[PDB]
Amino acid sequence: KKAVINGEQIRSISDLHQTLKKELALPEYYGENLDALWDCLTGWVEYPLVLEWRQFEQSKQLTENGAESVLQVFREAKAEGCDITIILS
Amino acid sequence: DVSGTVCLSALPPEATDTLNLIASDGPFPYSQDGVVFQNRESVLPTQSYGYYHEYTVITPGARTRGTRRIITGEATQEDYYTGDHYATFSLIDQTC
């Protein structure tokens, strides 16, 4: 499964969660917060997943490192053995 | 912050079944049950890693893990319920 985040266009953490809910096909009841995203990466998302997060350093700016907290969740799932490839640009 | 304290008899009856499984240490239905809960949004009081653990509350009919959980702390009867996929939590009062 391929998920693409255009990092220059996400200026709110809410729209980041909405864009994840669409690109990862999360459940309709997704809680739109970091603990729900961790529950979905360890129990719902399809794998292998490739997450292309373009213009990541721009997303860091606008969000205050709401972006870095999200990316840390994905890195922790990958470190537990979920088959995720993260490609930043 | 926690959103209030709610009597256990005002929650779904499956939350009492989850508390009773925690007290016997399972067996649980989901492999996520009993893992450490990292409280990543800091809705619950900030504590070191390992203080909290999470457990599913079944939703009858859903066919997935759904949105309801109990998170335990280490203080006596320190159990929190979320019924909205971790967005809010209440403290459970098991005496009413």
From Swiss-Prot, chain A:
Localization per Swiss-Prot or TrEMBL: Cytoplasm
Alphabetical list of Pfam families matching this protein: Barstar (PF01337)
Entry keyword annotation includes Cytoplasm: yes
Tree of life domain: Bacteria
Main location: cytoplasm
GO terms for cellular component: cytoplasm
InterPro entries in alphabetical order: Barstar (IPR000468), Barstar-like_sf (IPR035905)
Keywords, ordered alphabetically: Cytoplasm
Biological role: Inhibitor of the ribonuclease barnase. Forms a one-to-one non-covalent complex.
Recorded family membership: Belongs to the barstar family.
Record's protein name: Barstar
Protein's organism: Bacillus amyloliquefaciens (Bacillus velezensis)
Swiss-Prot record, chain B:
GO cellular component: extracellular region
Compartmental location: Secreted
Gene3D superfamilies: Microbial ribonucleases
Alphabetized UniProt keyword annotations: Disulfide bond, Endonuclease, Hydrolase, Lyase, Nuclease, Secreted
Catalytic class of the enzyme: lyase
EC number assigned by the record: 4.6.1.24
Known catalytic reactions: [RNA] containing guanosine + H2O = an [RNA fragment]-3'-guanosine-3'-phosphate + a 5'-hydroxy-ribonucleotide-3'-[RNA fragment]
InterPro entries given in the database record: N1-like, Ribonuclease/ribotoxin
Reported impact of residue 39 to A/D/S: Decreases protein stability
Keyword Amino-acid biosynthesis: no
Disulfide bonds listed in the record: 7-96
Active site: 54, 85
Pfam families: Ribonuclease
Coiled coil: none
GO molecular function (one): RNA endonuclease activity
Similarity comment text for this entry: Belongs to the ribonuclease N1/T1 family.
UniProt protein name: Guanyl-specific ribonuclease Sa
Organism: Kitasatospora aureofaciens
